[PDB]
Amino acid sequence: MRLFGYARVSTSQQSLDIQVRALKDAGVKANRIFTDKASGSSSDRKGLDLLRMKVEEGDVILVKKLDRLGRDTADMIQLIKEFDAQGVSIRFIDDGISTDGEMGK
C-alpha cells in the first residue's frame, strides 16, 4: 500500500505546487506526486499514464482535483477502471473515496 496522488496545473501561477500541497494535505507522499504540467507546449496528461504503471497492489490513489478531472468519453473513468482492475484504490477529496468497489461489498 502506498500514498499516490494525481495533480494537474490549471493556473499559470504555481499551480503544480497548489496540487502537490493538495495531495499532501489529503495524505499523499511528496515523492509519489504524479501531477501534470499542463502549462507546456500542449496539454500534458501523463501523470495518470505513469501513475497507472506506478500504483502497487492495493495502492491508494488520492485525487484532489480542484477544477475538473475530465468530462467527455471517460477521461475520469478510463484510468479509474484501469486501477480498479489492478486491485488499486482511488481516494477522492470529494468525500475520501469515489467508487471503492461498487459491486456488492
Curated annotation (Swiss-Prot):
Domain of life: Bacteria
GO MF, any single term: DNA binding
Keywords, ordered alphabetically: DNA integration, DNA recombination, DNA-binding, Plasmid, Transposable element
Cysteine pairings via disulfide bonds: none
GO biological process: DNA integration
Sequence ranges assigned to domain Resolvase/invertase-type recombinase catalytic in this UniProt record: 2-105
Active site, UniProt feature: S10
Coiled coil spans: none
Function as written in the Swiss-Prot or TrEMBL entry: This protein catalyzes the site-specific recombination of the transposon and also regulates its frequency of transposition.
Family, as annotated: Belongs to the site-specific recombinase resolvase family.
Name this polypeptide is given: Transposon gamma-delta resolvase
Native organism: Escherichia coli (strain K12)
Full protein segment contained here: 1 to 105 of 183
